[PDB]
Amino acid sequence: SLQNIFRATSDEVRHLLSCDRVLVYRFNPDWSGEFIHESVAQMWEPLKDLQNNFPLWQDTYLQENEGGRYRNHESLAVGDVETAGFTDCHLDNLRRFEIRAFLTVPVFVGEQLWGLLGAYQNGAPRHWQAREIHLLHQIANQLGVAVYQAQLLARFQE
Numbered sequence: 001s002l003q004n005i006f007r008a009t010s011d012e013v014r015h016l017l018s019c020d021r022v023l024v025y026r027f028n029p030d031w032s033g034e035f036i037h038e039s040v041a042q043m044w045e046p047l048k049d050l051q052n053n054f055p056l057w058q059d060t061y062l063q064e065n066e067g068g069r070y071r072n073h074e075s076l077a078v079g080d081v082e083t084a085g086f087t088d089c090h091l092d093n094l095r096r097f098e099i100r101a102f103l104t105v106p107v108f109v110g111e112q113l114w115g116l117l118g119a120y121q122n123g124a125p126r127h128w129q130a131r132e133i134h135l136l137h138q139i140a141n142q143l144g145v146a147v148y149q150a151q152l153l154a155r156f157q158e
């Protein structure tokens with residue numbers, strides 16, 4: 001349904017970026033959220049297993065700030081988490097999952113922030129390129145459309 005769409009999308013980013021993990025995050029109406037889909041290289045445990053054994057610092061930032069920078073269509077592009085100046089808790093979280101560089105972009109459904117699309121590299125910093133960021137935005141835009149049109153089709157319910 002939307003599941004094979006998330007799967008197709010997540011696998012597409014992972015291959016085009018040759019990264020370690022790709023995640024789709026979905027917001028709730030109160031701006032809490034969760035990761036609802038992953039594509040991950042064979043090397044690494046699924047997120048869900050990590051989450052069940054490897055505790056994290058609580059992270060309520062996005063929720064408290066109703067989507068944070070994503071709300072204004074901004075993205076995060078991080079070549080090295082170790083030099084980025086994150087809070088200690090955020091770095092410690094990223095470190096727990098061996099994330100060393102990542103990209104995170106907004107996903108808009110209609111004109112509302114629906115989620116995030118994240119791409120992660122473990123173990124070594126990255127020199128992200130503009131065309132990689134551009135392609136990630138294109139994919140994120142297409143995902144938004146797909147979800148938007150699946151909502152419209154649901155709305156068609158008689």
Ligand SMILES: *[C@@H](C)[C@H]1/C(=C/c2[nH]c(/C=C3N=C(/C=C4/NC(=O)C(CC)=C4C)C(C)=C\3CCC(=O)O)c(CCC(=O)O)c2C)NC(=O)[C@@H]1C
Pocket residue numbers: 025056057058059060061062068069076087088089090093094097104
């Ligand atoms: C320390 C934890 C303080 C805090 C910091 C903070 N966190 C964010 C943004 C995100 N936090 C996310 C949650 C997770 N949960 C995971 O399991 C995981 C590994 C895949 C992550 C990355 C999350 C998805 C985001 C958005 C992307 C990101 O990592 O930034 C921010 C906003 C940063 C910005 O500049 O946009 C801050 C400041 N959260 C807290 O509650 C502590 C006070």
Ligand SMILES: O=S(=O)(O)C[C@@H](O)CNC1CCCCC1
Pocket residue numbers: 068069084085086087
């Ligand atoms: O910029 S905001 O007001 O959205 C969010 C604020 O928590 C800043 N996050 C810093 C930004 C720079 C990299 C290290 C993390």
Ligand code: NA
Pocket residue numbers: 051056
């Ligand atoms: Na988590």
Ligand code: NA
Pocket residue numbers: 085086087090091
């Ligand atoms: Na931080």
Ligand code: NA
Pocket residue numbers: 102103104118
């Ligand atoms: Na992320």
